[PDB]
């Protein structure tokens, strides 16, 4: 292994991916306590200025409009002057975290089972390459199926993720079905303040959609020429069983409809993997 | 996974330990969706009856009294006709989960972990306290021991090697304190067996009363262990080790000394990291 | 104040507590220059006889055995015919001071932080009462937390040590983390000779474990019915910040393991008090 | 404490005054653990290089020559190629600390303190000498003054009241003599910034070269003070007062007259106590 990074607190890196914006706030006043340093391009004020403020005079008016279904359902589509956005709400460290990400406009045998899953996910995402790993007893990911376009750069990248995926990464994969790295060549954006005063550490990004990625893994994607990477967790009876990894040589937006279909497919596959016995 | 029992979804077992009571509810009406089957002795109605009801007409009034700091602080002590209780609130699967547990009434590196072992044994009063440090294969190595004179579980410095599954280590990372009040007690099922909105049992990752894997409960019984109380040692937010306390019978620890136990794990986490930078 | 005693040279009283024995010696011959008047019960010769002698024919053979780790580490446990003892070595006035004290046998918010410290120390010592003082800008100790057994003689002794703890006492508390008065009803033992010839004054007992206590404070403990008193200095960034005072109505040996855990706790607390800013 | 600067750990500032050099080492190998950053001009190697080395191959040979009386007497004069030096040895934090400072070459109660003031001004040659007596609130009261004709720091009988912090008075109690050679000079940092074995800087309570609190150094500069030389007046081992000498520029005092200064403080301590018993 590489113990120097297999103890990496990947939930505490204090950064997001640059295509979105993250805000966090506590209390009934809804006072901003965390804000990504890139937030001015979307919110019209400098981040150090927005700290301390209630969200009512911080969020764009289009978001505050949909605030009720946003709390109810945890997500809502909104149309900002900057374009279409997805808003996503979850709870963490006692803070309510708000993530804004660009969206399209809305105006007017077991190997055989996993092979069809591979082909199905590649059809839904359009990504060049899709790989399905199954974890063995040593938690090595075994390449079990591949779907790919004809004539490929990333050849047969059938190498196992061996003494590989650290426990903290597998724990996040268990708690989140979908993980998107929009562009491995893009730069992470730091969260402000660097440590949350109430916590003595950075905000926990375990369930954050925009969570920046361990540099060691981002470098592994870049060496492969991978731009976008989109991953689906395969659970069996609530336990991590495998991983579907989609790699595309450049950014390629997937869109919410086909992302949601991807997650439903992981739920359908979990049923099929468990019910095969009982 | 890591064998016949290391694939166990220990967060989804659907039970609590029998010394406490758990309720869960969604929505602004606060409609009961989850209830432990033992709840009648504390709430005065059958659980199958309390399902569907708002909490305002479900919880005892002493609890609803302190409901503001209970939501505010996440915990509050209350005095019920049955005696003193701790109420504990967290969110899970979109439900807000309330746990009621009885309480008393209210009117070098090896050397550092050696003192930690002696400090925890004095705070808990438990017969034996062990400090494990996890190596690179996530095997726990016994690094310090504090224990009373003349022991039944004498010198247990046998390592937990191909042992503590990832799901257990993940919960040790997310919760600083874990208490098994009595390994001879029986788990109490949560009702309904699967949450209708979820298709599975309520996720008990952050539950104080979460029941115990039958295989580990059986291993505790074989040792003559009654109570088991664990403190997670984190370094820079990553699981580093475990302080495991074993007692031959039940022994209440009490909130003051639990809270002192948790502060010590925070103090120790500073010392393990700041030792470098 | 009481200026008649707030200039008391409490480091120069020339006495020890009666439960231990103190020896001091200079030079490469290691010639006894200071000896407590109670030393015969442990060493088998009269103190005036042991003066001038090298330690090789003065110390018990069990102590001279462990002399190497005693110098190396500053402390060592030894088993004498009289029972188990702790030996403690430090330097003072150019003399090397040796203190022997009985030991058990070894054969086969900020207020919330200080409240847990109070409860933790009471658990480690077993003393009836534990009080935590924090010093304000006038160096008054403010009672900030209390841990105590149910149903108490020393009620709520929440009175501040006000125009109180003299500067010389606070200086010794800064230089020593742990201070034990084994029994406030016991009698101090004089050091011989009454003044050290080389110095023109008594041996400086600033860092002595057995140092006898100012009579005015010993009388204050007795009036409270206090037998044992065990104190821990709280430092922040090397400066005296507060004091944890343990009082027990009778003698109660604490034992080295739990004393050492007590001192580590004061070091851990000092980190938490300083790092809270930087 | 006693304000924004009266909590200052003046024994832990991690610097020395730039006119001298400090080394510290532990163990029987005499391994360098502390070294002032200015040490190369005197020892001929970079400080970061000398760390880890035994002193026998670190100190100049003239110093190791006199090493027996240096350990014996605690001080010895040596003649280096750079000129005459004083070597000074004491123990602190388990380290033995060696300080090198340049030296010249060697081939009623008010009335008593008035003569003491005139005696110290003649011994030091400094422009102004003040005698403070501490009252019961540990405020220093000006009790006698000796000074040259026509003064810049004319008649400074303003009291140091809510002033001299406890940490400064504790060091005045433990050291009879304190010299600030030049308040316009710059402190030299000790390397490494914290002692690895200690988690903090070396304790400089008994160091001759110990640097000065920035706030007090700035107050000296505002007065046009270059050199400052202090004598502690003890009565029965307790701090009683201070003789403070101020000079508008650096002025070496020389060991003979420093030693005479210290003997006078001992003679005065006899007279202040024996006046009763
Ligand atoms: C230092 C820790 C390591 C590590 C971290 C890591 N891997 C993740 C997902 C993942 N990694 C791989 C394969 C590799 N990643 C590497 O860095 C290397 C070698 C240098 C390899 C061979 C795979 C196949 C996967 C599954 C996802 C995929 O694209 O296939 C993650 C989580 C990333 C995230 O989404 O946040 C982390 C943190 N991987 C290691 O091998 C070691 C070096
Ligand atoms: C089937 C899975 C296994 C398993 C589950 C498990 N262990 C936990 C804590 C823990 N276990 C041990 C040691 C053992 N437990 C066993 O069942 C056996 C062998 C039969 C051994 C040797 C230790 C030392 C620890 C640390 C805690 C302690 O008391 O010392 C837990 C979490 C329990 C909880 O709090 O919920 C689980 C789920 N342990 C395994 O070894 C395999 C069998
Ligand atoms: C004449 C000097 C005084 C003095 C000396 C003193 N106090 C010490 C510790 C300590 N004292 C108190 C409280 C009191 N001590 C008293 O004598 C009186 C009044 C008569 C009071 C109110 C406290 C709270 C503490 C902290 C320790 C504790 O048990 O709480 C010491 C050092 C003793 C030692 O360990 O050597 C000295 C020398 N205290 C004064 O108030 C004045 C009278
Ligand atoms: C922030 C802490 C303070 C402080 C520290 C201090 N004083 C020392 C000796 C000393 N100071 C004074 C008078 C002053 N020093 C000041 O900074 C100020 C105001 C800005 C005043 C009025 C005197 C008279 C003395 C006695 C020595 C002398 O030269 O007269 C020392 C020790 C210096 C040393 O040798 O290391 C310290 C650390 N003094 C304070 O008044 C407050 C501000």
Numbering used by the authors:
A (entry chain A), C (entry chain A): 9 to 116, 137 to 306
B (entry chain B), D (entry chain B): 9 to 115, 137 to 306
Reproduce text from the manuscript describing this model.
In addition, we demonstrate how crystals of a severely truncated fragment of SaBphP2 can be obtained from which an x-ray structure with a very unusual chromophore configuration is determined. The overall structure of the fragment differs from those of the CBD of SaBphP1 and the CBD part of the SaBphP2 PCM. The asymmetric unit harbors a dimer (dimer-NCS) where the subunits are related by non-crystallographic symmetry (NCS) [Fig. 5(a)]. Subunits in the dimer-NCS interact much differently than in the CBDs of the other constructs. However, the angle between the interface helices is about 90° rather than around 35° as observed for the other constructs mentioned. The interfaces of both the dimer-NCS and the dimer-SYM are very different from those normally observed in CBD and PCMs of BphPs. Rather being in a stretched-out (all-Z) syn–syn–anti configuration, the BV assumes a curved all-Z, all-syn configuration [Fig. 6(a)], which has never been observed so far. Consequently, ring-D is stacked on top of ring A, and the BV forms a spiral staircase [with the pyrrole rings as four steps, Fig. 6(a)] in both subunits.
Phytochromes are red-light photoreceptors first identified in plants, with homologs found in bacteria and fungi, that regulate a variety of critical physiological processes. They undergo a reversible photocycle between two distinct states: a red-light-absorbing Pr form and a far-red light-absorbing Pfr form.
